[PDB]
RNA sequence: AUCGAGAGA
DNA sequence: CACTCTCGATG
């Protein structure tokens, strides 16, 4: 519930790969794994 | 580059030599340079090679390709397979690709070509042109829910 | 006697701690089988709830009445519902106890296994009775109930063996430990430097004579000495369920061999 | 829901006999005992004990798939030596010794305290 | 293409596996539910009428039953609402739709189908419990665990049908396949590992194990082998009880590296006649290589032969392991101090280098290697030294590891695991890397918000000291994560750009076939190749021999 | 010199030294016109084609080449008389259970080996993890790249 | 929920042993580890089982209905 | 029969990366030009440098192996450490140098002589006293 | 222990995914690809 | 699964004679393969086992916090301070037949949870079902007893193996098998069949 | 007071941060892992703490650190689909379908984040006695 | 037109699929209650008796091998070799 | 059944 | 361009 109550969603050069300025912002390990990988993110 | 050759005696000794590697590709002038062995001079461009030494070396460049894609990875297909795949690619003429612009544009049944990418507009232009379609092809048979030439029904059973 | 000798090191109402000598490996295992598996006791097999306002659901509440142990002395005459010629069951095969609690007090009201009440005709069987080794006498804590909460239930307890369900294990663990020192070699230990001072000297060490380096491997030596400890859960004292396990085990044993003895029927 | 019945284990099924003892084809002499509703319980102990009669010699015991309780005991005794008498003659003998150890450890349990 | 080109079908079933060390490596475990819905139409001979009707006698909601029975006239008698359910006369010539029994010939799948192997026939084991049971050795050509997986089941309709599936699509048919002229199964995880544990010198089996394991082969002859050793106690070698699992005429030879037919290090593998003389067996052998133990067998005893010996091996070797035991904690994780203490040293002398060639670079003294940039050769020179350092330091670790050191023995085995695994997980997880370069500056001039700008140190651009038993630090941890994540994104890239590739090489290559003048043609009748692999034979029966003629002085050739 | 071929010759004649138990110290009871023109005679019953025309002949001569010459490497008579020391039954038996063998490892006519081929790429392609390699080079093998990522020429 | 009725594991009863151990804890102000061990569970799935236990059943209570 | 009867002298012990078996290597202390390499299981008969091992090579003392009973059973040995296992491989060093292989279910073994009566058979039993 | 931060439409409850866009008012520069006439562009996205 | 990705179902059970047991009589709750750590490289998993053992005997908490100065070498000291194998080893015996392993089991408590994914939501068979209306094949769905799809890729491979019939089975009888008329002169269906 | 701040990633583009604390202070644990020596002087801000930079779900995972990160987040992804109790109430809810597990169980083995996503009192798993073993081989 | 009954191309061995589809058809003659034309000697299973009779020879048909151009070669089972 | 969403390998 | 269960709003 946690989990889905602070998620981030992203429509559509890499916006999958985690980038640098994603530390402490967005987690680097909780995203789900295939076609939705790197777009859907975690607070 | 290191390099198996025949000594005077019989066997085989590595004979090392100065090969030169190369960001860029114009085989049609590299290889009429004075100094270097224009019999083999090589490239990763299959298409310079088709264009250049012809639609065989092409075939062999094509498949040595592939099966160097294959064993990259530290893998191993048998011959026949690539080989079956790189003919199929070579036979008509040129380099047919694998594709929706390719194989799917040869003069083949309508349905089976149909049953591939372009769909619809593939049964509109045989309507178009009033194409017979053998219904010997795989997937044409797989259409009319019949017992395909294939394997077991590669034959005819009949009684004596 | 003459076979297989017994040493009780320690002795107490919940466990047994004793030395089998002159034994098999094979049989120390199977009466240790046994005696977790395949020693019969009483415990609640069947639940009708009648009333259920309590937070817990009906079949939780029945699982953790089921898991309650429950007087097995006399059970071996008590009967097995499916042998029993009568109808589902009765006093000759179960043991009909009723539970009625209801929340009274403003603070919670606790339901045990002390409320518990016998309701079937135990006919002079020591059975039934839930065990109760709590200080204050209380026992398991089987619910809690709030202010308005209610639960009516009544249990019949059948005669089981713990291979059909667990809740019929008369013993809880058996320690189980052969050739402390390793002399047999059944073991070849995991290390990083020295063997014998990353793993820890068993108790057991202090009852047999250490190796000597100048000495060689005895590749003649068996498994003779077996240091256990069983412990009971209350249904079953510690002595009894040794001696059931054996009694069984050798019951089971007879049943084969009197198995043979019907096959020579033509 | 497609889980069988727990009683399955000790619970011989319609027409199962406990016991089924069949001649072994490969070597002469030979027998197969096939023991329904048992476990390790009763195959490693009568192996074990089938190994102490030199008369004896071969003696196996297994249990083919964990699902079912039951478990194959291979006998292989000497010529004029029925491989039934050494099944026999070790159930007894665990018979014999269980008894014994069950009187010693009751005469052990009463000179006890606490 | 999702009507006609494929669409769902009857008599199927699917659901979650598992793997079962006590079935055939051609069986298939079906839930009984599973079983008593999926129906076979049996015609009622004077072969079979006894048993159909014994079958009706059960019908439905027992098995083995059956569900329907058609007569003449076409109708169908449900076995479950009919009121004459219990008395069925039932005629020669009816049909009668009994459960899936025994010896079934069924379609084992699992998706996605990449290859023949993917679809093979098994042969129905009914069984408890809800789930699909099949044989470990069959993982590999399904390309499947049991974490979660789900497979479906076909069966068959017809007598004709099943004769396809029993003689074309059988699995013993389907050890040694076309793909790479080799068997696509072979012995896998705990088989594989306890077998390695097996066949070791230090390995002797005692009289009672011995017997159990002699029993526990099916195919045994009764014959109690004569122990390696006599006296002073009667011991058999691990090679040897294995042996009885390997059928006679099985001659199977292949040197290592010091394999001198004495083979002080107990390798290489050398094999006369079904006995197993010397070597270690493992991956090499009993695996799914080229010319291993189960190629052999198939090609010399036959499919049947060989699929039986996966039982057997199976049989004999999870005994032994169970008995035995095998496990792996944090300590298989752990080298030596001093093993630590020159990893530690390694990885600094690796930053002093790379300290060295930057101070270096920064003088402007760095000469650029012939064809790019003086940055380009700084970050070549760079990488390559913090790889240096990973590998030294995982082989300082790898060589710290005893024999008896659990993950050092899967890898010995070939079980599971490999070098970096080791390197990662006790030395050094090494640099991490993004689109082929180290950690890219996401800040301007930098990588974190914790680094000063232009740092191109190690510990900047995502070289990991720590290894994962040390922990990682948080900018490791987030370097790593970087990394990891490329590793997501390029995996599911990967996944679906090459199941785009094999629809396309399918759909190209359809239509084509050998035709009876063994010319490979399509249905235009196009010759693709006149004679079929140019040679016109099947891969199959395709195994890598020498041509010892090509080799050799010419002296030698003439003696 | 290791290539794929069929008929594994070796195990052949390890199962005739092994069948027939013959000892590394006898005189073989063959002959040079036995083992000559055995082999020599063997490689006319190794069938692929079965034409009786000049082409399918030569297509035949052609398609058993390599074979042949495996054959010949393996049976010479200096091979045959001392490293095998081979009876003339167990090299009759050679013959014929290599001519078998031969005939079992031709090609069935009606397999589907376009999809075999198709799969036999395919799949081991979905076990994939300095010039472009890999996946992206195979979809520009097969795309048949214009402008493929690395163009490199190789001059030697 | 509720204090499980016997140890998963072994089969210990320990379902008699949760007020004993809260009282333990507040009453005599002891420790987890020594708490646990005058209950009498030497093996640590016992121990376990009561330490890892969490009383949810308290706030179910909290509801009317 | 009996095969071999030699006096071997151990010259190296080497526990190659076991714990219940060493690689023993020998020499006769007859010929000259006979040497002697095998597997031992030293957990049973342990073999320290420098010893004096009889060692004999018999073809007897197939049918199944029965427990040792009673016996009351020719053993035909009454040595100290007996060994059975199968010949594969018959090295010819030189004319007057031929070695044997032996194979006991691992436990390897290279006999190098000269004048021999071991063939290629199943029997082999190994034969170590003292 | 419920932590809000959702709606309850149709007895349903429902959460509002934060959608990820690019940020307006900011001037950005991209290098155009090779095939391209134009090498540089500097954009804005107006708010 | 347990709290490191390593997801697993139950392949069988035992009971707890079946079970291998420690010398003090300890069975565990659940078993997984040695061979579902090396590659995958989950040492959290096994530090996560170690700590937990120790805090269970010591019945404090463990702290597996992400960043923080927790080394094995320190739960080890602390575990054989309570009297076991530092690396926590345990010698377990067999429990079918009594007699000790040779090697150690890595031996101790693991966070497991239980996941949504159970084989009885799961299990799925369908013979002879409820068609569509439009195209009269199987429905889609466990729930709706639909059938399952034979799809292109196992169409290829049935077409690999050579089976035919069993290629027109699963395309006819297995499914939508339809006969209807056709005209001999333009070949279409505008035949209008009056049967009987 | 000033002491905490809120900074977006474009004010952390100018800004020098502190990992700890302790990287502001002026023979050592082999067990340790090795940590590079602060080579930065002007830090303007400190890191809260750095575990800090994980999400809800990865909060939960044991030594994250010690891990491979492909297995950080599928363990990510495995946590959503535990059960257990979900909320107290879940008797007085009537949700399209629910899991409560029988008898949840804290971890053994918790994160100091646990103490703030309420793990501790609405737990999802059970200590299991788990054995790392090749047992029966199923 | 036809293919004559000598100079014919094809492989005398029966192929695997024409051996499948034989004991496929045969079998499923059997399993309508079929005449047997080899003796049963205790097999009932239908598949199998098509086994035992394609072993004796004892099945009346005849594989028609359809060559790309049109034409066809008539072999019938007895003559076909089965080394599989 | 028709369109979106979550997730399983 | 690349098999499932499911949910939940819509005609
Ligand atoms: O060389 C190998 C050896 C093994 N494997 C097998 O794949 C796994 C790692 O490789 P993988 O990336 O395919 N992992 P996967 O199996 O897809 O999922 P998961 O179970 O979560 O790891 C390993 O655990 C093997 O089962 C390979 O894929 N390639
Ligand atoms: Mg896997
Ligand atoms: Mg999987
Ligand atoms: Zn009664
Ligand atoms: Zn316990
Ligand atoms: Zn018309």
Redesign the interface.
């Given at each position: 519930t946690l989990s889905h109550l602070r998620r981030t969603n992203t429509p559509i050069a890499k916006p999958?790969?985690?980038?640098?300025?994603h530390?402490g912002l967005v987690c680097?390990?909780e995203?789900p794994?295939?076609?939705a990988?790197?777009l859907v993110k975690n607070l | 580059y290191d390099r198996k050759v025949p000594?005077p005696?019989?066997?085989?000794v590595k004979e090392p030599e100065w090969v030169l590697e190369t960001?860029g590709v114009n085989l049609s002038e590299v290889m009429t340079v004075p100094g270097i062995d224009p019999t083999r001079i090589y490239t990763n461009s299959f298409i310079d090679i088709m264009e250049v030494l012809g639609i065989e070396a092409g075939r062999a460049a094509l498949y040595k390709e592939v099966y160097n894609v294959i064993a990259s990875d530290g893998?191993?297909?048998?011959?026949?397979?690539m080989?079956?795949?790189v003919?199929?690619m070579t036979?008509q003429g040129g380099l047919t690709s694998?594709?929706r612009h390719?194989?799917n544009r040869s003069?083949?049944?309508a349905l089976?070509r149909c049953?591939?990418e372009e769909?619809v507009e593939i049964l509109f232009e045989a309507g178009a042109s009033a194409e017979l379609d053998?219904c010997?092809?795989?997937?044409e048979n797989?259409?009319l829910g019949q017992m395909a030439p294939?394997?077991?029904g590669?034959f005819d059973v009949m009684i004596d | 006697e003459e076979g297989p000798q017994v040493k009780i090191r320690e002795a107490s109402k919940d466990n047994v701690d004793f030395i089998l000598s002159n034994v098999d490996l094979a049989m120390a295992n199977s009466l240790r089988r046994v005696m977790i598996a395949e020693i019969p006791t009483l415990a609640i097999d069947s639940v009708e709830v009648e009333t259920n306002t309590t937070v817990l659901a009906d079949e939780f509440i029945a699982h953790r009445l089921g898991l309650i142990p429950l007087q097995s002395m006399d059970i071996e005459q008590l009967e097995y519902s499916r042998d029993c010629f009568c109808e589902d069951h009765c006093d000759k095969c179960s043991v009909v106890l009723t539970l009625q609690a209801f929340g009274e007090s403003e603070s919670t009201t606790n339901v045990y296994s002390k409320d518990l009440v016998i309701v079937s005709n135990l006919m002079g069987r020591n059975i039934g009775h839930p065990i109760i080794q709590d200080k204050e006498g209380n026992g398991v804590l089987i619910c809690k109930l709030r202010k308005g909460q209610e639960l009516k239930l009544t249990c019949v307890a059948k005669k089981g063996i713990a291979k059909e369900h667990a809740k019929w294990g008369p013993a809880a663990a058996i320690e189980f430990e052969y050739d402390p020192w390793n002399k047999l070699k059944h073991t070849?230990y995991?290390?990083?430097?020295d063997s014998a001072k990353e793993w820890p000297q068993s108790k057991n060490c202090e009852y047999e004579d250490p190796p000597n380096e100048g000495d060689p491997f005895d590749?003649?030596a068996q498994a003779d000495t077996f240091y256990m400890n069983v412990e009971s859960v209350g249904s079953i004292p510690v002595d009894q369920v040794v001696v059931r396990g054996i009694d069984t085990l050798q019951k089971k044993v007879a049943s084969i061999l009197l198995a043979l003895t019907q096959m020579d029927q033509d | 829901?497609?889980?069988?019945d727990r009683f399955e284990l000790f619970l011989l099924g319609e027409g199962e006999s406990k016991l089924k003892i069949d001649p072994?084809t490969?070597?002469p002499n030979?027998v197969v005992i096939t023991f329904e509703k048992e476990d390790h319980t009763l195959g490693n102990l009568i192996?074990?004990e089938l190994?102490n009669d030199r008369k004896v010699?071969?003696?196996?015991?297994?249990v083919?798939?964990?699902?079912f309780a039951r478990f194959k005991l291979?006998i292989?005794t000497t010529e004029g030596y029925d491989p039934k008498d050494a099944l026999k003659n070790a159930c007894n003998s665990i018979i014999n010794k269980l008894g014994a150890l069950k009187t010693n450890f009751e005469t052990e349990w009463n000179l006890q305290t606490l | 293409?999702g009507?006609?080109?494929?669409?769902?079908?009857?008599?199927?079933?699917?659901?979650?596996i598992?793997?079962?060390?006590?079935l055939e490596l051609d069986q298939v475990g079906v839930?009984?539910?599973?079983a008593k819905?999926?129906?076979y139409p049996?015609?009622v001979?004077?072969?079979?009428i006894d048993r159909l009707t014994q079958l009706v006698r059960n019908g439905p909601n027992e098995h083995p039953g059956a569900?329907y029975v058609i007569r003449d006239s076409g109708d169908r008698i449900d076995l479950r609402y009919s009121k004459r359910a219990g008395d069925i006369q039932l005629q020669?010539?009816w049909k009668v739709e009994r459960h899936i029994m025994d010896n079934d010939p069924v379609?084992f799948?699992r998706?996605?189908?990449?290859?023949?192997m993917?679809?093979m026939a098994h042969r129905v084991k009914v069984?408890?419990?809800?789930?699909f049971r099949l044989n470990?050795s069959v993982t590999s050509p399904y390309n499947a665990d049991?974490?979660?997986d789900?497979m479906?089941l076909?069966?068959?309709?017809?007598?004709?049908?099943?004769?396809?599936?029993?003689?074309?699509?059988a699995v013993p048919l389907q050890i040694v396949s076309?793909?790479?002229?080799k068997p696509c199964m072979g012995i896998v995880?705990?088989?594989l590992?306890?077998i390695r544990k097996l066949?070791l010198?230090?390995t002797?089996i005692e009289?009672?194990q011995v017997?159990?394991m002699?029993?526990?082969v099916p195919d045994?002859?009764?014959?109690?082998?004569?122990?390696?050793?006599?006296?002073?106690?009667?011991?058999?070698?691990?090679?040897?009880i294995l042996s009885v699992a390997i059928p006679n005429?099985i001659?199977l030879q292949r040197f290592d590296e010091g394999t001198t037919?004495?083979?002080?290090?107990?390798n290489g593998m050398?094999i006369?006649?079904g006995?197993?003389?010397?070597g270690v067996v493992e991956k090499k052998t009993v695996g799914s290589s080229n010319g291993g133990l189960i190629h052999?067998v198939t090609?010399?005893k036959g499919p049947q032969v060989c699929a039986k010996l996966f039982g057997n091996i199976?049989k004999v070797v999870?005994f032994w392991?169970?008995?035995?035991?095998?496990?792996?904690?944090?300590?298989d994780?752990?080298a030596?101090?001093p093993t630590?203490?020159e990893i530690?040293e390694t990885?600094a002398e690796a930053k002093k280098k790379v300290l060295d060639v930057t101070k270096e670079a920064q003088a402007n003294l760095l000469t650029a290697k012939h064809?790019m940039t003086l940055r380009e050769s700084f970050e070549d020179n760079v990488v390559r030294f913090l790889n240096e350092a990973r590998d030294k330091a995982g082989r300082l670790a790898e060589v710290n590891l005893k024999?008896?050191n659990?993950?050092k023995q899967?890898?010995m085995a070939g079980?599971?695991?490999?070098f970096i695994?080791?390197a990662?997980?006790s030395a050094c997880v090494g640099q991490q890397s993004?689109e082929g370069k180290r950690?890219?500056?996401?800040?301007?001039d930098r990588?974190?918000?914790?680094?000063?700008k232009d740092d191109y140190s190690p510990?900047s651009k995502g070289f990991v000291?720590?290894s994962?038993?040390?922990?990682?630090?948080?900018?490791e941890?987030?370097f790593?994560?970087?990394?990891?994540?490329?590793?997501?994104?390029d995996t599911?890239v990967?996944?679906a750009?090459?199941?785009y590739?094999?629809?396309?090489?399918?759909?190209?290559?359809?239509?084509?076939?050998?035709?009876?003048?063994?010319?490979?043609?399509?249905?235009?009748?196009?010759?693709?190749?006149?004679?079929?692999?140019?040679?016109?034979?099947?891969?199959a029966?395709?195994?890598?021999?020498?041509?010892?003629?090509?080799?050799?002085?010419?002296?030698?050739?003439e003696k | 010199?290791?290539?794929?071929?069929?008929?594994?010759?070796?195990?052949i004649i390890?199962?005739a030294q092994?069948t027939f138990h013959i000892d590394h110290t006898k005189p073989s009871d063959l002959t040079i016109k036995d083992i000559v023109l055995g082999v020599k005679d063997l490689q006319e019953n190794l069938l692929?084609?079965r034409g009786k025309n000049e082409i399918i002949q030569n297509?035949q001569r052609?398609?058993?080449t390599?074979?042949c010459?495996?054959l010949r490497?393996r049976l010479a008579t200096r091979r045959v008389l001392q490293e095998y020391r081979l009876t003339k039954q167990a090299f009759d038996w050679v013959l014929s259970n290599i001519e078998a063998?031969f005939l079992?490892?031709?090609?069935?006519?009606?397999?589907?080996?376009?999809?075999?081929?198709?799969?036999?790429?395919?799949?081991?392609?979905?076990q994939?993890?300095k010039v472009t390699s890999g996946?992206?080079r195979?979809?520009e093998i097969?795309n048949v790249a214009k402008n493929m990522k690395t163009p490199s020429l190789t001059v030697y | 929920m509720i204090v499980p009725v016997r140890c998963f594991s072994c089969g210990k009863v320990v379902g008699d042993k949760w007020e004993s151990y809260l009282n333990l804890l507040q009453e005599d102000e002891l420790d987890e580890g020594t708490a646990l061990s005058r209950l009498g569970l030497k093996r640590y799935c016992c121990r376990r089982m009561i330490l890892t236990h969490v009383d949810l059943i308290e706030k179910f209570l909290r509801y009317n209905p | 029969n009996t095969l071999f009867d030699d006096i071997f002298q151990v010259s190296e012990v080497?526990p190659?990366?076991?714990?219940?078996?060493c690689?023993i290597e020998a020499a006769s202390t007859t010929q000259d030009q006979c040497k002697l390499?095998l597997?031992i299981?030293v957990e049973?008969?342990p073999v320290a440098a420098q010893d004096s091992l009889t060692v004999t090579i018999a073809s007897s003392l197939?049918?199944?192996?029965?427990?040792?009973q009673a016996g009351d059973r020719s053993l035909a040995?009454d040595?100290?450490?007996?060994?059975?296992?199968?010949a594969?491989?018959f090295?010819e060093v030189s004319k007057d140098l031929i070695a044997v292989?032996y194979?006991?279910?691992?436990?390897?073994m290279?006999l190098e002589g000269n004048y021999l009566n071991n063939l290629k058979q199943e029997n082999a039993?190994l034969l170590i006293r003292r | 222990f419920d932590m809000g931060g959702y709606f309850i439409i149709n007895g349903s409850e429902k959460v509002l995914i934060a959608q990820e866009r690019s940020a307006g008012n900011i001037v950005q520069v991209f290098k155009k690809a090779a095939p391209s006439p134009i090498s540089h562009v500097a954009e804005i996205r107006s708010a | 699964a347990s709290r490191h990705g390593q997801?697993?179902?139950?392949?069988?059970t035992y009971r707890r004679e079946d079970m291998?047991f420690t010398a003090e009589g300890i069975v565990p709750d659940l078993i997984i393969?040695?061979?579902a750590?090396?590659?995958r490289?989950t040492?959290?998993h096994?530090?996560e086992?170690?700590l937990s053992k120790v805090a269970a005997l010591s019945g404090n908490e463990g702290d597996a916090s992400?960043?923080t100065d927790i080394?094995?070498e320190g739960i080890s000291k602390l575990l054989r301070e309570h009297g076991y194998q530092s690396?926590?080893?345990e010698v377990?015996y067999?429990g079918?037949?009594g007699?000790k392993?040779?090697?150690?089991?890595?031996?101790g408590p693991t966070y497991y949870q239980r996941?949504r994914?159970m084989?009885?939501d799961?299990?799925?068979?369908?013979?002879?079902?409820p068609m569509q209306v439009l195209?009269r094949?199987?429905?889609?769905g466990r729930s709706r007893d639909?059938?399952?799809?034979?799809?292109?890729?196992?169409?290829?491979?049935?077409?690999?193996?050579?089976?035919?019939?069993?290629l027109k089975?699963?395309?006819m009888?297995?499914?939508?098998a339809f006969r209807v008329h056709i005209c001999g002169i333009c070949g279409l269906m505008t035949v209008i069949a009056k049967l009987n | 007071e000033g002491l905490v701040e809120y900074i977006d990633a474009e004010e952390?583009?100018s800004?020098?941060?502190?990992?700890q604390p302790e990287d502001l202070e002026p023979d050592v644990d082999?067990?340790?892992?090795?940590?590079?020596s602060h080579?930065?002087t002007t830090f303007t801000?400190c890191?809260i703490h750095?575990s800090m930079?994980l999400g809800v779900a990865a909060s939960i995972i044991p030594?994250?650190?010690?891990?491979?990160?492909?297995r950080?987040?599928y363990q990510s992804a495995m946590g959503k689909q535990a059960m257990g109790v979900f909320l107290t109430n879940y008797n007085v809810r009537m949700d399209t379908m629910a899991n409560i597990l029988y008898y949840p169980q804290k971890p053994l083995g918790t994160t100091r984040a646990m103490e703030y996503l309420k793990f501790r009192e609405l737990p999802a798993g059970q200590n299991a006695i788990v054995?790392?073993?090749?047992?029966?081989?199923? | 037109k036809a293919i004559p009954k000598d100079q014919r191309?094809?492989?005398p061995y029966m192929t695997?699929?024409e051996?499948?589809?034989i004991?496929?058809?045969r079998?499923?003659q059997?399993?309508?209650?079929a005449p047997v034309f080899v003796d049963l000697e205790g097999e009932?299973?239908?598949?199998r008796i098509?086994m035992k009779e394609l072993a004796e020879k004892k099945i009346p048909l005849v594989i028609r091998?359809?060559?790309?151009?049109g034409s066809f070669?008539d072999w019938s089972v007895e003559e076909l070799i089965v080394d599989l």
């Open positions: 999958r790969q985690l980038h640098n300025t530390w680097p390990a995203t794994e295939g076609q990988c790197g | 000594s005696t019989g066997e085989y960001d893998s191993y297909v048998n011959y026949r397979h080989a079956l795949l003919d199929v036979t694998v594709t390719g194989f003069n083949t049944g089976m049953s591939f769909t053998d010997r092809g795989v997937s797989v259409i294939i394997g077991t590669a | 070849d995991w290390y990083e430097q590749y003649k | 829901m497609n889980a069988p072994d490969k070597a030979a192996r074990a190994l010699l071969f003696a196996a015991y297994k083919e798939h964990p699902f291979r292989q | 293409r009507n006609l080109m494929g669409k769902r079908v009857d008599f199927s079933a699917r659901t979650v598992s793997g079962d060390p006590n839930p009984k539910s599973i819905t999926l129906t049996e015609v001979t004077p072969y079979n569900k020669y010539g379609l799948n998706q996605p189908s990449l290859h023949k993917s679809m069984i408890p419990y809800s789930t470990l049991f974490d979660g789900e479906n076909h069966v068959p309709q017809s007598e004709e049908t099943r004769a396809e599936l029993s003689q074309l699509c076309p793909q790479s002229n995880q705990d088989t590992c306890g066949t010198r230090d002797f009289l009672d017997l159990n002699l029993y526990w045994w002859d009764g014959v109690i082998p004569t122990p390696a050793i006599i006296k002073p106690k009667p011991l058999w070698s691990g090679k040897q005429g001659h037919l004495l083979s002080p290090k107990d050398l006369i006649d006995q197993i003389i010397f052999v090609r010399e199976q999870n392991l169970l008995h035995n035991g095998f496990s792996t904690g944090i300590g994780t752990i030596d101090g630590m203490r530690t990885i064809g024999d008896l659990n993950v899967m890898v079980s599971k695991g490999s695994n080791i990662q997980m993004v950690i890219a500056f996401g800040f301007v990588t974190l918000p914790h680094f000063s510990e000291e720590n994962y038993l040390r922990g990682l630090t948080p900018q941890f987030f790593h994560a970087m990394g990891g994540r490329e590793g997501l994104i599911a990967k996944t750009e090459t199941g590739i094999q629809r396309r090489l399918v759909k190209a290559l359809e239509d084509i076939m050998v035709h009876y003048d063994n010319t490979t043609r399509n249905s235009l009748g196009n010759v693709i190749q006149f004679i079929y692999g140019e040679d016109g034979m099947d891969a029966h395709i195994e890598k021999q020498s041509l010892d003629t090509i080799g050799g002085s010419d002296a030698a050739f | 010199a290791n290539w794929p071929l069929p008929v594994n010759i070796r195990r390890q199962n092994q692929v084609l297509a052609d398609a058993v390599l074979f010459c495996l490497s063998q079992r490892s031709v090609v069935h006519p009606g397999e589907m080996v376009g999809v075999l081929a198709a799969q036999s790429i395919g799949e081991p392609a979905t994939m993890t996946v992206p195979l979809k097969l | - | 080497d190659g990366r076991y714990n219940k078996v690689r390499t597997d299981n049973l008969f197939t049918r199944s192996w029965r427990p040792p040995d040595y100290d450490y007996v060994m059975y296992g199968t594969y491989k090295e292989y194979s006991f279910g691992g436990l390897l290279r039993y | - | 997801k697993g179902t139950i392949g069988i291998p393969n040695p061979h750590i090396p590659s490289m040492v959290a096994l530090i086992c170690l992400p960043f080394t094995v690396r926590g080893f377990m067999n079918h037949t007699k392993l040779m090697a150690q089991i890595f031996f996941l994914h084989v009885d799961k299990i799925h068979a369908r013979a002879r079902g195209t094949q199987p429905v889609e639909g059938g399952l799809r034979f799809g292109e890729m196992e169409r290829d491979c049935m077409i690999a193996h050579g089976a035919a019939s069993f089975e699963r395309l009888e297995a499914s939508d | 952390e583009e800004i020098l941060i502190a990992m082999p067990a340790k892992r090795i940590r590079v080579h930065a801000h890191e750095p930079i030594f994250p650190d010690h891990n491979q990160s492909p950080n987040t054995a790392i073993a090749c047992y029966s081989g199923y | 191309a094809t492989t695997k699929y051996r499948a589809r004991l496929g058809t079998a499923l059997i399993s309508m209650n009932t299973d239908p598949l098509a091998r359809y060559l790309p151009d070669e």
